[PDB]
Ligand SMILES: NC(=O)c1ccc[n+]([C@@H]2O[C@H](COP(=O)([O-])OP(=O)(O)OC[C@H]3O[C@@H](n4cnc5c(N)ncnc54)[C@H](O)[C@@H]3O)[C@@H](O)[C@H]2O)c1
Ligand SMILES: NC(=O)c1ccc[n+]([C@@H]2O[C@H](COP(=O)([O-])OP(=O)(O)OC[C@H]3O[C@@H](n4cnc5c(N)ncnc54)[C@H](O)[C@@H]3O)[C@@H](O)[C@H]2O)c1
Ligand SMILES: O=c1ccn([C@@H]2O[C@H](COP(=O)(O)OP(=O)(O)O[C@H]3OC[C@@H](O)[C@H](O)[C@H]3O)[C@@H](O)[C@H]2O)c(=O)[nH]1
């Protein structure tokens with residue numbers, strides 16, 4: 078049993094991951110940007126080196142899961158000061174800590190680093206494909222790619238031991254609605270309130286249920302390979318177009334699509350994210366159990382409970 | 387037509403030379419930098435601070451903006467990374483938000499550091515068609531310049547902003563003060579003029595460019611501005627030399643031997659060779675440097691003797 082730090086530990090993936098790691102008997106400190114009522118929790122703004130160093134003055138960590146971030150492509154454009162300071166300077170503070178202390182780190186990147194690539198998003202597309210294939214389309218995507226490069230330069234210069242993960246389209250319990258969240262919680266919250274929402278038809282995604290993904294994220298402790306990078310998401314065969322996902326939300330809520338406005342495609346948005354999960358299947362026992370239809374049913378149920386509907 | 391031009395980083399090395407070249411052509415030029423000075427047509431503005439950026443534009447309308455404001459140098463970037471990311475990236479995003487509102491034309495200062503450790507001809511299209519692993523940026527400073535380029539291209543795509551990117555290479559000459567964080571030329575010159583020891587890492591090659599030549603090329607962008615373009619600006623492909631050759635030119639111009647020099651094989655985490663292609667600057671920007679390294683180094687030795695009395 079390891080001592081583990083989860084930054085962004087009060088977020089959506091963070092909350093789920095902290096619970097998964099604790100269920101495995103790890104000792105886990107959750108750190109995030111606000112005070113909470115949680116146990117084994119500490120506020121630390123990762124932009125502030127003093128507050129990052131204070132996390133490490135208490136105890137030694139074997140593993141650090143670094144999720145602390147400004148999340149979302151349009152959040153990143155609208156709040157870019159917070160984005161760059163948190164996602165990049167915060168990551169560099171974590172790397173300076175890792176170079177001093179020698180913990181193992183799991184860096185949270187994003188499938189947004191593949192840009193608008195139309196082919197199979199294998200991890201080696203960010204190695205052997207022409208650079209123009211994956212040009213990042215928004216500041217958020219660039220912060221995650223800069224993070225990856227900084228992790229590799231730290232490894233080269235100081236022998237730091239880091240695994241990078243590229244999460245994909247995660248949904249499920251502990252993801253609150255806001256207008257800056259992804260499509261699934263937008264669709265569910267709006268459908269639950271009979272409020273109109275837009276479907277941009279011309280795109281496809283693979284959605285991953287958070288309970289599955291954090292199982293895989295937690296498996297990195299059991300087979301940690303310094304220098305590696307993994308796409309972590311659902312299954313290649315779970316790819317759907319956006320109307321298919323909307324129709325699953327509406328069916329689980331029990332209404333038709335009269336509240337839906339159909340548009341052809343969202344500008345400046347990736348068309349398709351056709352992921353390859355073969356490396357996670359190989360090294361991390363990746364084996365997701367909850368496909369979109371069942372996952373959306375569970376997420377509708379959780380939001381009804383959470384919002385006291 | 388005489389233009390109204392803003393130069394950020396206008397009290398720095400290239401900035402001071404560029405402001406002078408532009409004013410000599412009869413442009414109206416406001417210089418902006420991080421400190422108060424005695425200079426005329428000068429304003430302090432910290433480009434990290436949006437309010438201070440906005441204030442630059444509340445007085446005057448600018449036709450062209452040369453954006454040089456930056457934390458310069460790979461080792462400076464590692465040692466002062468907070469300042470690096472906030473100035474080089476957040477500052478550039480503030481300038482792009484201003485460009486989106488006001489519609490001025492911008493020249494963005496990147497770096498040949500964006501080519502990483504590439505061993506082939508560093509043509510601009512290496513950052514387009516070559517495998518991404520060929521040019522992985524090796525330090526935070528290099529990443530900030532590549533991030534800036536991507537942000538410029540995303541602004542052009544989303545808002546129709548008109549930007550030319552330049553990749554300066556290894557610039558030297560008058561108005562470059564010595565510090566320990568400067569590049570190899572002023573380090574060699576200053577130390578030699580003071581009989582102070584310095585190291586030569588032999589296993590590298592560079593092409594060095596005299597600043598009065600480079601700013602003539604930078605000023606020429608006003609006369610032929612092609613939205614979306616990117617140019618390497620430096621000396622000539624055939625001015626390539628190994629580091630000992632440059633040391634020997636400095637020592638000869640000072641009038642001493644190399645007893646102050648310690649020879650090492652190669653500098654870790656440092657690009658081996660920067661074999662630049664200037665064919666695009668020759669085509670579009672009348673690039674025609676008059677001052678090769680031998681003569682350039684003589685003139686720079688002369689200027690440092692005057693400055694440091
Ligand atoms: N589908 C996905 O959700 C997805 C996809 C790709 C990448 N990611 C990445 O996975 C991670 C988790 O995403 P999420 O969906 O849980 O988002 P989230 O916003 O719910 O989680 C991020 C957490 O980081 C915290 N945080 C922000 N700035 C901070 C700071 N300065 N100091 C400390 N904490 C700070 C936030 O308060 C939040 O709780 C992020 O790194 C995100 O970029 C997620
Ligand atoms: N000199 C070279 O060989 C070379 C090579 C590649 C790229 N570049 C780029 O060219 C530009 C000029 O380089 P230089 O050699 O003249 O360096 P320099 O440091 O002399 O010039 C940069 C200037 O930016 C100013 N500055 C820094 N932070 C600022 C802030 N927040 N607000 C306002 N001003 C700020 C500095 O005070 C300085 O005067 C930089 O963008 C640099 O990265 C130079
Ligand atoms: O209201 C909406 C929102 C989104 N969509 C569509 O749903 C798809 C998914 O969009 P999301 O923004 O949820 O997800 P994206 O994959 O585009 O990026 C999102 O998830 C991955 C993260 O790394 C990014 O930061 C985040 O913005 C897109 O095709 C979008 O057009 C709608 O049809 N309607």
Ligand SMILES: O=c1ccn([C@@H]2O[C@H](COP(=O)(O)OP(=O)(O)O)[C@@H](O)[C@H]2O)c(=O)[nH]1
Pocket residue numbers: 460499555556568569570571573584585586587588590591592629652653656657660
């Ligand atoms: O004291 C020094 C500093 C640098 N260099 C070498 O000079 C070259 C130019 O390095 P600089 O940092 O000036 O520029 P860059 O590497 O960023 O092009 C590199 O090969 C360095 O190894 C050197 O021999 N001695």
